[PDB]
């Protein structure tokens, strides 16, 4: 059974998703079988109350492009015990992307995929452009790292 998955704790944890990024954020919940399940998106600079649970796993992505985002400065978010009944913050931010990855984001936003190969670049960068960021590949990378 998949390593990265929420546990069925049945222990409520009040959370507030706080989008501190300029992107439209897609919160993605890993269900009890490790399958990613999307929750409604958050406009930039907005926040939202969630009823989640102890030991559930979340990650967060640009809704339009699936660029990775950070939550409390890391890849994954796990709601904890509500200490003194106070909700937990999930602060969603931009990472410091590599200059390369950031250039790829901008070129992707301007060029339709059918036309990537009509740009005057070397072979390796076409591949790079085509290899869109992807939740499923991120989970496989995280699982491998966690072994």
């Amino acid at each position: 059974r998949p390593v990265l998955r929420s546990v069925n704790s049945r222990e409520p944890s009040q959370v507030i998703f706080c989008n501190r990024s300029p992107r439209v954020v897609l919160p993605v919940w890993l269900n009890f079988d490790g399958e990613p399940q999307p929750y409604p998106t958050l406009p930039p600079g907005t926040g939202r109350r969630i009823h989640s649970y102890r030991g559930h796993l979340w990650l967060f992505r640009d809704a339009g492009t699936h660029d990775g985002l950070l939550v409390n400065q890391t890849e994954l978010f796990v709601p904890s015990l509500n200490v003194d009944g106070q909700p937990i913050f999930a602060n969603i931010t931009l990472p410091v992307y590599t200059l390369k990855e950031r250039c790829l984001q901008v070129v992707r936003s301007l060029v339709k995929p059918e036309n990537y190969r009509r740009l005057d670049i070397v072979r390796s960068l076409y591949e790079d452009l085509e290899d869109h960021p992807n939740v499923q590949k991120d989970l496989e990378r995280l699982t491998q790292e966690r072994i």
């Binding site: 069925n8 049945r10 939202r48 969630i50 009823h51 649970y53």
Partner: peptide, 10 residues
């Protein structure tokens, strides 16, 4: 089995 997924019930 009694699965409770997160809600936007909030």
């Amino acid at each position: 089995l009694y699965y409770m997924a997160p809600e936007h019930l909030n």
